[PDB]
Amino acid sequence: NVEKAIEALKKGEIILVYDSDEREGETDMVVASQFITPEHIRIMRKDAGGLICTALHPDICNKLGIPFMVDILEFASQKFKVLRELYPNDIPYDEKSSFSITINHRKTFTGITDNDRAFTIKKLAELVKEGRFNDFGKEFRSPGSVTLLRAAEGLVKNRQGHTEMTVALAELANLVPITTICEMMGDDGNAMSKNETKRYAEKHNLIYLSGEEIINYYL
Amino acid sequence: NNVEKAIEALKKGEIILVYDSDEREGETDMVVASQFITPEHIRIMRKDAGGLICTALHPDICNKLGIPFMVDILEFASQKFKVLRELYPNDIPYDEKSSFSITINHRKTFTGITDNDRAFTIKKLAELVKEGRFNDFGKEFRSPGSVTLLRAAEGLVKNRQGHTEMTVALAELANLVPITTICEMMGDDGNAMSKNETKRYAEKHNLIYLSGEEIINYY
Ligand SMILES: O=C(CO)[C@H](O)[C@H](O)COP(=O)(O)O
Ligand SMILES: O=C(CO)[C@H](O)[C@H](O)COP(=O)(O)O
Ligand SMILES: [Ca+2]
Ligand SMILES: [Ca+2]
Ligand SMILES: [Ca+2]
Ligand SMILES: [Ca+2]
Ligand SMILES: [Zn+2]
Ligand SMILES: [Zn+2]
Ligand SMILES: [Zn+2]
Secondary structure, three states, X not given: OHHHHHHHHHOOOOEEEEOOOXXXXXXXXXXXXXXXXXXXXXXXXXHHEEEXXXXXXXXXXXXXXXXXXXXXXXXXXXXXXXXXHOOOOOOOHHHOOOEEEEEEEOOOOOOOOHHHHHHHHHHHHHHHHHOOHHHXXXXXXXXXXXXXXEOOOOHHHOOOOHHHHHHHHHHHOOOOOEEEEEEEEOOOOOEOOHHHHHHHHXXXXXXXXXXXXXXXXXX | OHHHHHHHHHHOOOOEEEEOOOOOOOOEEEEEXXXXXXXXXXXXXXXXXEEEEEEEEXXXXXXXXXXXXXXXXXXXXXXXXXXXXXOOOOOOOOOOOOOEEEEEEEOOOOOOOOHHHHHHHHHHHHHHHHOOOHHHHHHHEEEEEEEEEEEOOOOHHHOOOOHHHHHHHHHHHOOOOOEEEEXXXXXXXXXXXXXXXXXXXXXXXXXXXXXHHHXXXXX
């Protein structure tokens, strides 16, 4: 299943990845960011509906200098003490947020259109693939509409969220280790269930992959 | 005229459409009074609008809570994370500054992103403020989260004419807690939904549709 999913990712397709019944119990739509299109963004906002985020391998975040948003807030809590009252001290370690900064490519206007978000994401993967790390600040601004996620060091070895799982899968496909993901939301107000997302994959002929499968394959 | 109608709509917990200006974003946001938000509103916003789902707060509220603009948090944090410095939004195309603030989740939510969780977070925020329980902010919410907050400018539309100020302006005029939840309406072509298509939506679902100038003048 993993290998089949790698083939789909290499073709610029969206695949579906479920984490686990024990964790978020959620399914994310996933694309290799280097192949993102305005169409992917439209399908994600319409059919998934969660936040559209772009996950980056730890090595990339270290080269760009991108930290966890929690670390940015903790440092800033010195001046803005409310950020201290909002500390996420009640979240299980395994679920600690992968949230990083938000950005827009400077060439975008409002930054929120499908065209703008696909451009912002595609230009970021372009910059990273080409190794023009220093051009990051020249080309992008923060805050913005595209949320970046920082994957854990050692990926699925230390954290098993969609952030790690999907980046691990892009690494395994020999692609730039950056993915764009969006949680699938249901009409009952909760996350779409595993059976409901498996059903969506069958209808739209997309690959449905199990998180444990990626984890086992990678490890 | 239509402003009064829009006010009556907001008081009834309904959604209204607010277009800013051709000379600004040229976008239309679906808007609801946060004290009246429901999971169904979140679902209509993500499926039929599609942009980010943000919650705008009157500056007075922000001051009582100590909530700063995100750019200020990043500016201060740039002392530790240099990349932030190089990500400054010094070239924002449509206005002098962003209304972006911190993101939050109520501590009682699970993943924070579901319709049920996002409505719970926003409504509880509106209730806490309505009850003047500001000292409970940190006790009930954490950051980062899936709900993005926006800080309206001091003096509302007197100093900034964004959807952030305009909607907070309307809520105030309606004698409601000055906190709104807004989502940009996106088009199938990849650009923001056109003034025309947003009009067709409003007429089809009988929602009050307003323009920026009308709200500003009325305020
Ligand atoms: O929080 C999220 C988006 O912002 C989603 O859960 C997304 O799948 C990435 O998070 P995680 O790695 O914890 O699964
Ligand atoms: O940035 C945004 C995300 O919520 C939208 O533009 C929203 O309408 C608020 O921004 P503004 O006050 O500039 O119109
Ligand atoms: Ca998560
Ligand atoms: Ca804006
Ligand atoms: Ca201005
Ligand atoms: Ca009608
Ligand atoms: Zn997840
Ligand atoms: Zn706007
Ligand atoms: Zn209708």
